[PDB]
From a paper:
Methylation catalysed by catechol-O-methyltransferase (COMT) is the main pathway of catechol neurotransmitter deactivation in the prefrontal cortex. COMT is a single-domain Mg2+-dependent methyltransferase that catalyses the transfer of an activated methyl group from S-adenosylmethionine (SAM) to its catechol substrate. The crystal structure of COMT comprises a central β-sheet flanked by α-helices, constructing a bipartite active site that accommodates the methyl donor SAM (in the so-called adenine site) and that can also complex an Mg2+ ion to which the catechol substrates bind. Here, a set of apo, semi-holo, holo and Michaelis form crystal structures are described that define the conformational space available to COMT and that include likely intermediates along the catalytic pathway.
We have determined such structures for rat COMT in a variety of conditions and crystal forms. Water replaces Mg2+ and is contacted by Asp184 and Asp212. The β5/α9 loop has now swung out to its maximum extent. In the open state neither the adenine site nor the Mg2+ site are formed. Residues His185, Trp186 and Arg189 stack on top of each other, with Trp186 occupying the usual position of the adenine base. In the absence of a ribose, Glu133 hydrogen-bonds to the indole N atom of Trp186. The different sequences, crystallization conditions and crystal settings all indicate that this form is a recurring state of apo COMT.
Residue numbers in the entry: 45 to 257
The structure:
């Protein structure tokens, strides 16, 4: 335990109930808040993520970007039996911590972690990972990857009419390249979400882009 992601997991093991996803989600939040890393992700990012999942009930979700596994736990706990979450992460440390988090949550059954580059794995999804089309895409942590990844998922025919793309940390004026694309193009129907919590400043911003075929 030297890295931040290692400390998050250390804090989870020492405080969260093993096999209880909510206890885990709460432990990550409590720790990230006291150490002033992420203010209140559980109600900022979390509630938006939950609402999107309950609204669309996706059978196949692809997460592009992972750090400590919060998003993976938050998403997996709401999936239906038969539903699966494919998480792609380039960093082997972030990919490892995420696996351990899911393992601790008792959700590894519902998640498949793919350690490698999005640019290389996305074109392999159809044959190598038995994927026809994605019902949902979750874009996380790496803002400069949102646009090329979206463009790639389109090139690869992984999106269909109704595919939901949910991008995190899409806060004004950051990540404008991706925004100009989805908002601009008649191929996406967009909804922005700005979580303020009890404060007057955007704690978290999220873009929901529904593909129209
Ligand atoms: K649009």
């Amino acid at each position: 335990g030297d890295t931040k992601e290692q400390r998050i997991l250390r804090y989870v093991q020492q405080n969260a109930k093993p096999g209880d996803p909510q206890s885990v989600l709460e432990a990550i939040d409590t720790y990230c808040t006291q150490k002033e890393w992420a203010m209140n992700v559980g109600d900022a990012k979390g509630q938006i993520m939950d609402a999107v999942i309950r609204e669309y009930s996706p059978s196949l979700v692809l997460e592009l970007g992972a750090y400590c596994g919060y998003s993976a736990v938050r998403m997996a706990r709401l999936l239906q039996p038969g539903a699966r979450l494919l998480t792609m992460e380039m960093n082997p440390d972030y990919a490892a911590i995420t696996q351990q988090m899911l393992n601790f949550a008792g959700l590894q059954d519902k998640v498949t972690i793919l350690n490698g580059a999005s640019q290389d794995l996305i074109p392999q999804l159809k044959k190598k990972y038995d994927v026809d089309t994605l019902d949902m895409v979750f874009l996380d942590h790496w803002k400069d990857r949102y646009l090329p990844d979206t463009l790639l998922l389109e090139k690869c025919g992984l999106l269909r009419k109704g595919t939901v793309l949910l991008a995190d940390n899409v806060i004004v004026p950051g990540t404008p390249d991706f925004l100009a694309y989805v908002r601009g193009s008649s191929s996406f129907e967009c909804t922005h979400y700005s979580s303020y919590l009890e404060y007057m400043k955007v704690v978290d911003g999220l873009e929901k882009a529904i593909y129209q075929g």
